Every structure is written in structure tokens, then in C-alpha cells.
Amino acid sequence: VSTLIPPKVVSSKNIGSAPNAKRIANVVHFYKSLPQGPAPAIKANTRLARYKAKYFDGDNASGKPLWHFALGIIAFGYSMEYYFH
């Protein structure tokens, strides 16, 4: 009876579609995300900070700390098993 007009009705149509739900999701997931590894806090300073940078960081993550623990028992020979039970 006349010229129908569904070419321009997306101003209220862009709310119910599924991609819009993902659209409003990931845009919030993007703006505050740190750009290039910023704010990594690589300078750890808490009590034994030196340990935090050699083995406690996790780059090595090997049996050295338990080796250090074992050597501590060895150095305590005349303190726990000798001169005492």
C-alpha cells in the first residue's frame, strides 16, 4: 500500500542480538588491561628479598632450596644430634 521502511530500524535493534551481549562484555574487558607488561612489580623487597630473586622467584624452581635446607641440618651437627638427642 506504500513504501515499507525497515532499512533504518537498528537504533533499537542493536540490543537484543547475541553479538551485542558479547560486544558489551569484551569492550569492558579491554580498556583497563595493562598495555605492555606494565606494573609487573619485578622488584620484590620483603624480608629475605635476595631469596625472592634467586630461587623463590621460580625461574630455577629446582632442588637447591631443599639442598640449602639439608646443609642447614649438616651445619647443626653439634647442636641437635650432638650435645643433645
Binding site: 515499507l4 525497515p6 530500524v9 537498528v10 533499537s12 535493534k13 537484543g16 542480538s17
Partner: protein, 89 residues
Amino acid sequence: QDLYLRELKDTKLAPSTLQDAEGNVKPWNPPQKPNLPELELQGPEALKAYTEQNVETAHVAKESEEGESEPIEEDWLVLDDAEETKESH
């Protein structure tokens, strides 16, 4: 010569009153006048239709209007239906 002149004269006696003049017709018992110029004068319009297409009935074209000039109750409904279509589009 005479035999042609007399038949030429004969064309001025028998058919002279037939169509050359209007003295009806002597040999015929039925008359010649109340057939063609009064009964058959309307004969062409006795073959076609009278008082409708011989008068030709110059009729004003029936006027058609727009969509009742009522946009608000349909354009928004069309706009609402446009939403329905574009979800399906």
C-alpha cells in the same frame, strides 16, 4: 441509340422515385420511407448501445485517496513491525 436511351429513360422512371427522388415506390407494396430514414436511422445505434456509449457518458473518473492521512497509528506500528522483521532479517 434508342434501346439504351429508353432503358436510360427507364432508370429515370422506376428508380427515379426510389432514391433519385422521394416519391416512395410504385412497384413495391411495402413502403420505402419508414424503413431506412426513421427506423434504420437509429439502426446503427440499434446495433450498438444507446444513451450510454453513443451519448458516450463522459464520466468523471472516480477519485482515489491516500492512506486516509493517518500515519501515527500505522507508521509506528510499521516501525514496531520493522523491529520484528529486522530481528528476523
